[PDB]
Every structure is written in C-alpha cells, then in structure tokens.
Symmetry: C4
Subunit: 219 residues, 4 copies
C-alpha cells in the first residue's frame, strides 16, 4: 500500500487540498473573532474546526509513513508536526493560551507554499552571521540591567526594581521609545547624573545596531 | 481632422500649457485653505476651478482620440482620467471626501512632467521585489492580530477588542510609537506576561523590516 | 603693498591665528551662557568680543584685496563674509535673533579648517542627487497637508487648522513622533476613518524615505 | 621560575579557568540582585565575591611577569587591569558607584574569549572613519545648544536653562523622542517660530546620521 499512499501524499491535489484548507481555516479564525458571528454560526465553526484538525493529523500521519526519519530531520516538517500538536491538546485544562496558540497553524501557509519557504529561509539564513553580535548585546544588556537594578530600582521599582524590569526598561530605552520624558528625565529628578548612565548606553546600543544592519548589507 | 489635433495635443505648447495650469491650480488650492481669502476672492477661485476642470476634460477627450486603446494601457494616462473623473462628480451628494479627493489632481504635476515620472517609476519598480516580504508580514500581522484580539480585547477593547483594532494597535507597536508606557506596560498591569507577546513581535517585525531595506540596497 | 599683504594673508601664521581666535571666541560664548560668569567677567567678555569682531572684519577686508572677484565666488568665503556681517549689526534694533545668530561665526571653524571642509563638502554633494526625491516629497506633503486642513482642521485646529499647522503635524507623523496616541487615535474618536488617511501617508512617506537612504548608498 | 609560570599563564587550562570564573561570578552577580537571595545566601556570595577578586588580582599579577612592557601596551590587558583595579577599591569610602562599577568585570568574558574580541574590534575599528563627522556634529550640537539656551531657557529653564540642559534636550530632539508634543509644540505657545529652529536642526542632524550609516556601509 506504501507506493499507493506515497502517490497520494506526493500528489499535487493533496498539497493543493491542504493549502486550500489552511486558507479556509484562516478565514474561519478571523470570523471566530467576531462576537456576533460566534452567536450566529459558532457551532458551524467549531465542528469545521474540529474536522480540519483531524484532516491535518491524518495528513501528518500519512506524511510520516512516506518519509519516516527524513521527516523528523526536516525543519518545515517538524514545524507542522509541532503546530498540529498544540492544536491537539484538549479544549480545556492547563493554560488557556493553548486554545490561543492554535492560531499558529496559519503559519502552515508559509510551510506549505514555496517562495514563502524561500523568503522565510532567506530571512532565517541571516541569523547565524549575527549571533556573534547578538551575544555581544545580550552580554551588554545583562551587565547594564544589573547596574540599573542596583542604581535605580529602590526609588523607581516599577522600572528597575528587578532584573527582569531593568531588562524591560533597558530594552525600551533601546527602542528609543519615550526614553527621556518617560524614563530618564524622572530618574534625574532624584539622580541628577542618570544621563551619565543612559547616554553612553544609548550610543553603544544604537552604534551596534547600525553595524549589525550594515553587516546584513554585506553578507 | 485627426492629424490637425494630433499636432495640437502632441505639441510642446500643449504639454507646457497643461503644466502651467497645474502649478496654477495648485497655488489656487492652497489659497482656498484660508477662510479669509475665501470671504474676499472665493468666487474667483471656484470659477477658475470649474474652468480648469473643463480644460482638463477637453484635454483628456482630445488625448484619447490621439491614442485610443494605447491610452487605456498607459499607467500615467489612466491616472489622469481617474483623477479628473473624481473632479467631475458634482460638488454635492453621496460623500464629501470626493470634494476633498479633488486635490489629487495636483499629482498630475508628477504625471505630466518627466524626472518626476522617472523618479516615481524608480520607486515603484522596487515594489514587486518586496511583495514576497510584504505578503509574509501581512500573514504575520494577521496571525498576531488574531492572537491579540483573543488575549487582550476583553479587558482592553480600545486596543485589541476588534480584529481591526489589533491590526491598528499592532501597526503602532511596529512603528515603535509609544508602545511601552503607551500600550505594553498597561497591558502588563493585568497580564504580567504580555511582554512575551510583544517583545518577540517586535524582533521579528523590526528584523524583517531591516532585511526588506537591505534587499532594496542590493537590487 | 599688495604682495606684502598677499604674503600676510596667505601666511600660515595668519590662517592659524584665525583658527586660534575662533576656538577662543567659541569658549568665550559658552561662558556667556552662565549668569554667574556674566555677573563677574561680563565686561571682559563683551570687549574681548567687539575686539575679535574687528579682527575678523579687518581680516575679511585684507582677504578681499588679495582675492577680489575670486572671493565672491568661493562658497566658504561668502559664508564667512555673511556670518561676520551678521556679527556687525549693532547690539540693538530690529530683531534680537541677530544677537543670537552671532554664534554662527563658530561655523568658521568648519570653513577655516580642512578635513571639516572636506567632510562638509562630502555631505553637501549628496544633496543634488536627492532633489528629485525631495521635490517629490514636497509635492506630496503639500497635497496631503491641503487634504488634512480640509479634513480635520475644523474640529482639530491645533493640529490642522491652518496649512502651516498641517505641514508641522504631517512632519511629526513622518518622524513617527507620538503619531497614534498623540494624533491619529484622537482624530479617530471623531473621524473613525482618519486611519485610512494616515496609514497610507505613513507607508508612502517612509517607503520613499527608505529609497532615498539606499540612493545615498548607490552613489 | 619565569618559564615555569610562563607555562602556567600561557596555558589553555589557565585561560579556561579564568573564563570559567567569569561565567560563575557573572551568575552570582545577577543573584545578588534578589533581596530574597541575599537574606539567605548573602554571606556565601560576598565571600565567593571577595575570593574571585583575589584570584583575578593573582592572575593579573602573574600575567604581568610573563609580558612586562608588552602587557601595558595591549588594550585588552589594560582593560582587565583597570576593571579589576576598580574591583579592588575597598567596599567603602568615596562614591558608591565604585561598588557598582565592580559589575564591569563581566566585560572580561569579552576580553578573555576570542570571537567577542574579534567582533568588538570589528566594531571599534569603524570609529576612526567616523571621527571626522562626529566632530562636525559636536561643533553643531555645541552651536545650537548655545543658541537654544539664549533663545528658550528663560521661559523654559527645565529644558534649556543651562548649556548642559540644552545639550540634553537637543540630544533628545535628535533621537526623535517625544520631540513635538513633548518639547517643540510647547515652546511654540510662547515662541511661535521655534519650529524654524527645530525643523532645520532635525534635518541637518538626521541627514548627517544617514550619511554616517552609509559611510560605514562602504568602508
Ligand atoms: Ca522613534
Ligand atoms: Ca517615539
Ligand atoms: Ca511619547
């Protein structure tokens, strides 16, 4: 039966049927957004939803008999396994985020269509050439975040009262979002010299980000 | 009579006469901004307007004889038809935006002057080389915008209550505009982990956006 | 006497004596900032100022005999002329910005020193290959600024009441400064669809601005 | 004993032991953040901290015998000296930042592990190409800041009262952070024309910065 199903699986119709289902389930989940639509046709939605999840498990079952170990060594394959997995956890218990993480299956439209795969892969491909810097930054963030927590988190615990918060705040300064009037100006009403901490910080972190951008304009 | 008018239309004088009306009508439309100017010379400029709109339809009518099916296959030409057409719809009824859309005819200074035409075309040509990325992002937005609406729209309907509002809010976070103490920090007062949605969101969407600019610094 | 003075003017001493005066006057101007320093050594600094102003006119006089027609055709020279002229307008009368524009003489350190000259010139030379785009943008701003004054100016005059006010607002949105919470969200409390005016505006204006940056990494 | 020690110091195991201590003292400093942790394991860590500091002074002493004058001419060596020297100053007297600047020793994970040094050096190397511009700007910032103080610091001393305050404000306007609603709009309720000072200031300073980024994407 193997070469029967391997012919079924590899069939354009099967792929196109899958891609068709995604773009239908995509449309379905945007309608699940409306409180109106849900009162009207929620049942229609929840069963069509449960149907699709079965069909996707069927497919993923078939897809593995036809690739075995080659499958679990394929990123894209792995992804699809993992996304439908989430979608499988019951409509109750644990963390309600799961019910929400389900919408991640609309990322299968990226996986099931090349060019997208191309583009995604084009994008991803740039990452390893950056991990040298990224690690540099995270070391930097970590070091300043600790200075911040023990320089400012007593009078300003919302922003710096905890390592986690200093990170968050330092990240915010880095996106340069409301970073003067929002955070540094106030800091200075108590600590005149907070500009000595954050102006160097800004320079470093912005400079680095410019280099990292130009690095992707080279390789 | 064809070659008579095909010599009128195709003439230098004709083109430079059209350009002369545009830069005149453009100056006329900025004087219609002032409530003062309108109480004195308002009548002058309303007629001057109807005059030019005639002249432009006369011209467009002429322009079509001289070109026929060639004309409805030229972008720049089509534009001028559509823009003058908008300028024809009576100063009443339906919606008033059409009265406001009339100011789009000053885009003819682009259409009817090279260099501008050149420069506009330079920019536009880059678009098809982005459409892979653009599509990617829209799918990304769509996925997150749905996830946000069902994670935050109950307590925070201003921002995430409707699919569209999540789109809007998400675009805002992307421009990195007051996303911290303007959206995220609030959200957190209720959903401590909301950083886990938005910090990732930010990496991806800024990352991508960096690439898309590096692409346009290659082609 | 000409070649005697033409030897004074071209003299390394003279050149370096000017450079010496600038950096001294510059330091003098940041001391004039302090209310304290002015209550102590104000008269010192006022005379030291009038002195230098003569020295710079004497020089610019000497400089002209030595160069004649050649001098009013040298950018860096013309500047130096005009910027000293400003410094000559009596410590009174007309506008008091003239008392303030006097600190533009410290832009002579750019003129009277190469490398600076080099770099400034390097920068400036990019401008002409941008005027095609800059033109395009101005037309765009002007078109959208008009629309906005006749679409939000009536209820929202602080931000769109006048053609000038809209230009400013539009410039603010373009720099993405508080554009959503500060501008578009409010607007939208009255005009639900203002987003249809601003999101496109923002795409266009930033796209164009991306190109112009890549343009200065082609040339 | 020189070659005995020159073989200890230069040894891989000595390096890998130093890197191992950094990564441990690193972890331990992010734990000293928790007030909880300090009330339980505080003594453990303060002792652990004083230990490593000796080990680092021992090492830095050893490192010097093995290199002599070659050592105080190596950036990376000097750094480690100065950072450990700070850490040597007793847990008392003076400013309190020295007790905080102590966390700068986690910058040794950069100095004493290749790849970072590479990347760091790749960064720094770019700086010399920038110092021509950087200077230009700093003359500019100095010039406008003086103008600003005498144009706006009487009504608006928070932001422009002092030469230093204007620096800071100008820096802020440059990062484009809340610059309209937060600074320039206000100024305008008193000085209608301040946009004439800040629109140009913004152009100039953003232009320059675009070049400077394009400069680094070529050299
Ligand atoms: Ca910003
Ligand atoms: Ca901002
Ligand atoms: Ca803000």
């Amino acid at each position: 039966m193997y070469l029967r199903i391997t012919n079924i699986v590899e069939s354009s119709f099967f792929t196109k049927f899958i891609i068709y289902l995604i773009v239908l389930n995509g449309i379905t989940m945007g309608l699940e957004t409306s409180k109106t639509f849900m009162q009207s046709f929620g049942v229609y939605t929840t069963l069509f939803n449960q149907i699709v999840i079965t069909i996707f498990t069927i497919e993923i079952i078939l897809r593995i008999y036809v690739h075995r170990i080659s499958f679990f060594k394929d990123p894209w394959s792995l992804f699809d396994f993992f996304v439908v997995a989430i979608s499988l956890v019951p409509t109750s218990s644990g963390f309600e985020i799961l019910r929400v993480l389900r919408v991640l299956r609309l990322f299968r439209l990226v996986t099931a269509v090349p060019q997208m795969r191309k583009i995604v892969s084009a994008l991803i491909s740039v990452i390893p050439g950056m991990l040298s810097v990224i690690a540099l930054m995270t070391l930097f963030f970590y070091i300043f975040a600790i200075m911040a927590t023990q320089l400012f988190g007593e009078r300003f615990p919302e922003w710096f009262g905890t390592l986690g918060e200093s990170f968050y705040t330092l990240f915010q300064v880095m996106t340069l979002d409301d970073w003067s009037n929002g955070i540094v100006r106030p800091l200075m009403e108590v600590y005149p010299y907070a500009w000595v901490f954050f102006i160097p910080f800004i320079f470093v972190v912005t400079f680095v980000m410019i280099n990292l951008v130009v690095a992707i304009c080279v390789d």
